[PDB]
Amino acid sequence: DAQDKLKYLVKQLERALRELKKSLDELERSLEELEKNPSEDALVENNRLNVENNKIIVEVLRIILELAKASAKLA
Amino acid sequence: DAQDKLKYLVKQLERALRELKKSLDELERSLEELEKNPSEDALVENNRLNVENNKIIVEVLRIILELAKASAKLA
Amino acid sequence: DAQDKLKYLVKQLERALRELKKSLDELERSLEELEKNPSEDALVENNRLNVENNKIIVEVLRIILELAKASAKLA
Ligand SMILES: N[C@]12C[C@H]3C[C@H](C[C@H](C3)C1)C2
Ligand code: NA
Numbered sequence: 001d002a003q004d005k006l007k008y009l010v011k012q013l014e015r016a017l018r019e020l021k022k023s024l025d026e027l028e029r030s031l032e033e034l035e036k037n038p039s040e041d042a043l044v045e046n047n048r049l050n051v052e053n054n055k056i057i058v059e060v061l062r063i064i065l066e067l068a069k070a071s072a073k074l075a
Numbered sequence: 076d077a078q079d080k081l082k083y084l085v086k087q088l089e090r091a092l093r094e095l096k097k098s099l100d101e102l103e104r105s106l107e108e109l110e111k112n113p114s115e116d117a118l119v120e121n122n123r124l125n126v127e128n129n130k131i132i133v134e135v136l137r138i139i140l141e142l143a144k145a146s147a148k149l150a
Numbered sequence: 151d152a153q154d155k156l157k158y159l160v161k162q163l164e165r166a167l168r169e170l171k172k173s174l175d176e177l178e179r180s181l182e183e184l185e186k187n188p189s190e191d192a193l194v195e196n197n198r199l200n201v202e203n204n205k206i207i208v209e210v211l212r213i214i215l216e217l218a219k220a221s222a223k224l225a
Contacts, residue, residue, distance in 0.1 A: 003225045010218050031201045051106045053204050054128050068085050075078045126181045129203050143160050150153045
């Protein structure tokens with residue numbers, strides 16, 4: 001099953017990276033707004049989006065750990 | 076040695092991801108506090124925790140590079 | 151071609167991680183400055199550098215996805 005499981009995990013990684021890119025775009029837009037008009041509200045919003053981007057990164061890294069675990073089997 | 080080295084590196088990745096999750100939890104708690112009561116102090120603390128989370132991510136990515144390097148040998 | 155492509159992708163990952171480390175260093179310096187003398191300007195600058203570090207992380211993760219895709223071929 002390892003090779004097929006790896007195929008699925010690659011699809012999961014692709015999907016998560018599409019989500020991560022959307023997050024990064026939102027974060028970059030919020031940064032542009034912050035730089036244009038700095039304020040407490042713009043700082044908080046930017047931080048919020050930064051934290052969410054980190055969260056998604058952690059999710060991506062967990063999928064990569066599953067790739068490594070499924071690879072070990074055939075190794 | 077490559078297959079055994081990969082086993083060790085997977086254990087390192089697991090351990091680092093446990094550390095990353097603890098960091099992300101701390102970061103998310105700091106975000107909640109910031110949103111509840113925004114202030115300069117809460118902003119700095121949240122940024123601090125965000126930077127630490129990035130640091131840990133870089134450490135995780137270096138372990139993944141070692142996975143790729145050890146895989147190449149048997150490739 | 152998969153094994154050779156993987157060699158190239160490992161070189162790309164190494165290069166990107168050198169860039170990521172330089173970014174993390176800049177980010178950590180900006181954090182130290184922020185903690186020393188907090189201000190709106192120091193907050194924005196730190197956020198800017200944090201976002202850039204996330205951007206580079208996303209680039210690194212895309213290289214790892216290409217590693218997984220090239221591995222699947224020989225799997
Ligand atoms: N074989 C691997 C390809 C990719 C990089 C590294 C960790 C995971 C994902 C498995 C080696
Ligand atoms: Na921030």
